[PDB]
Amino acid sequence: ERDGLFCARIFGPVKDYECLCGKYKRLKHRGVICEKCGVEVTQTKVRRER
Amino acid sequence: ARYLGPKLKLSRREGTDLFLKSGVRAIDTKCKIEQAPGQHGARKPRLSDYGVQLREKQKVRRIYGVLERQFRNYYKEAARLKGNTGENLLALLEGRLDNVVYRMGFGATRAEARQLVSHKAIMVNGRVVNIASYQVSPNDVVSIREKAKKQSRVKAALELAEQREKPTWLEVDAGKMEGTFKRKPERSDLSADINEHLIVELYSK
Amino acid sequence: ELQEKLIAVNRVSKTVKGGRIFSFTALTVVGDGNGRVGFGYGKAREVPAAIQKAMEKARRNMINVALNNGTLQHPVKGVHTGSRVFMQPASEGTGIIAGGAMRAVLEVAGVHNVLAKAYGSTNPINVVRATIDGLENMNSPEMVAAKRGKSVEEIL
RNA sequence: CCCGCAGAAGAAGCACCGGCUAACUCCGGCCAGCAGCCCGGUAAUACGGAGGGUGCAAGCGUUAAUCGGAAUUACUGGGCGUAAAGCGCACGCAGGCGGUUUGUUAAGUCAGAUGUGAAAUCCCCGGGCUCAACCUGGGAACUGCAUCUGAUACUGGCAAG
RNA sequence: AUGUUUUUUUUUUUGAUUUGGUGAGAGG
DNA sequence: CCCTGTCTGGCGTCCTCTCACCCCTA
DNA sequence: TAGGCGGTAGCGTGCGCCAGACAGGG
């Protein structure tokens, strides 16, 4: 739930390179962040450090 | 002069979410966004070069809710102007009054914003502008007039926007219900998925 | 990282005592979105195998091209057998103005902005070859400076 | 032009879906029919109807006509052994082109200026009709012609080699 | 000596290593 | 201010194995 | 399908040492 304790737009995506909206599942044409949920399609290891 | 039919059908045909519905409810719930419209939806063969260009053009067109002659007009204008053509065309499309409104968050959809514009709700620099295709110019303030200020649909649109990401090239006030179009947007500020260069090529046949 | 486009596929026949044996030719081209480009022309009894071969061949014998940022460095002509090709550098935003096989090779090459006409034959195979030739012969400013014993600013 | 009234109210069709060419299925016998070029003889994505789609939209199609694509008369920009294309062979007037050096001229050529090249149209920056079309201020352009003043590498003229 | 003498049936493509705690039992 | 009592904070072996249990009531 | 003694009070009660600060008595 946005934006409670477990979040997605504070702490990052749950899955690897898969945003919460569903826009992007790539890593070749990466770097670009999401617009719907605004979740930077990156890695889930970043939920261990944010 | 407008597309009055099903909206999600267009989205399905394009493949992507075109934001033709407000965004309270997710698109996947409302429709089979992956599957193309009609009896022969599940079948999906690789398109042609011309065809992909055409689809891209359609996507953009559908996003903004313009019709073909008008786009051709926009494109020729962009070509005339200095600088990158596709970028120019995108800027032109953005400058449309109804799109501007939608970005503000006074219309849930772009269609809603267009309707507002038509119904003498919006003012540009304190003068009521009715044309959705009206190209808004830098440092132009654009506001809701006092009559239309009481509408519930406006505040709902504003809330939806607040959920949505805010554009940098604008500055809007939710209490005053007026926003300043500070500058014409940069290509970076816009969505990356749009392949302007295909559009350009399409008309450079 | 490499992108690959099958330009064309064509059925070709061989007459034998029994009848006609059919086969398929696949013309593909591959590139890394930078200078480097390579075409392959494969043949097999079935289509997918032939395109696989085309990809394999293209992947080897690639060729480098000196790109000024998104476009070319100067107008260049290239020919092969019937297909005679003109292509001209163009301003950012214009896109690839080119027809058919030629287009494809340009895209994989990572040129984004060209004005380009194929005179003469438009036989995909020959025209792509001609394109490749025009791209190869095209030299850069630094290259010409080196050739001529000068600095880049001298040449401008 | 502005204000007030009511109520989704009065307001969407045309072409196409074999490939070129975006869009596919079912039902009806080389007939009936289609067709721009390249289907139909009983499982037609090509005829007709339906459903579904695609593209345009107060328009949509067809026909006619022009340029384009056509580098398919090729100045830019094609060719001629076999694809169309070398006169059967020569001489030779007109015509076209013309080794090398110096001098001179300044016709061609180039540079600058002046005069003109109507306005409108086109293009650039602006302004005004709510926007646009439209109207409109200023510029640029009108690639030219004529003159005057220079330059003299090249081409030409004249004079000597 | 002779053959333009019965015209007819098949183009392109979807997924490989996975999972927690507090307490009573119990081997040195 | 100089003791002297009270108070509340710290700490109290290692490794392994097994088992149950992990809201019901309004 | 939805929330933190359960009650018109009282539950706690079987470790022990050391130590250092906070304060009581004089």
Curated annotation (Swiss-Prot), chain A:
The RNAP catalytic core consists of 2 alpha, 1 beta, 1 beta' and 1 omega subunit. When a sigma factor is associated with the core the holoenzyme is formed, which can initiate transcription. The rRNA transcription and antitermination complex (rrnTAC) consists of RNAP, NusA, NusB, NusE (rpsJ), NusG, SubB, ribosomal protein S4, DNA and precursor rRNA; S4 is more flexible than other subunits. Acetylated on several lysine residues in the presence of glucose. This is DNA-directed RNA polymerase subunit beta'. DNA-dependent RNA polymerase (RNAP) catalyzes the transcription of DNA into RNA using the four ribonucleoside triphosphates as substrates. Co-administration of salinamide and rifampicin or salinamide and myxopyronin suppresses the emergence of resistance to both antibiotics. Belongs to the RNA polymerase beta' chain family. It comes from Escherichia coli (strain K12). Zn(2+) 1 binds at residues 19, 21, 34, 37.
From Swiss-Prot, chain B:
Pfam families: Ribosomal_S4, S4. The keyword Transcription regulation applies. CDD domains: S4. Residues 95-155 form the S4 RNA-binding domain. Transmembrane segments: none annotated. One of its GO terms (cellular component) is cytosol. GO terms for molecular function: mRNA 5'-UTR binding; mRNA regulatory element binding translation repressor activity; rRNA binding; structural constituent of ribosome. InterPro entries: Ribosomal_uS4, Ribosomal_uS4_bac-type, Ribosomal_uS4_CS, Ribosomal_uS4_N, S4_RNA-bd, S4_RNA-bd_sf. This is Small ribosomal subunit protein uS4. The gene is rpsD.
UniProtKB/Swiss-Prot annotation, chain C:
Residues 2-65 form the S5 DRBM domain. Keywords: Acetylation, Antibiotic resistance, Ribonucleoprotein, Ribosomal protein, RNA-binding, rRNA-binding. Changing residue 12 to E: In strain: SPCR7; spectinomycin resistant. Not a ram mutation. GO terms for molecular function: rRNA binding; structural constituent of ribosome. PANTHER family: MITOCHONDRIAL RIBOSOMAL PROTEIN S5 (PTHR48277:SF1). Belongs to the universal ribosomal protein uS5 family. This is Small ribosomal subunit protein uS5. It comes from Escherichia coli (strain K12). The gene is rpsE.
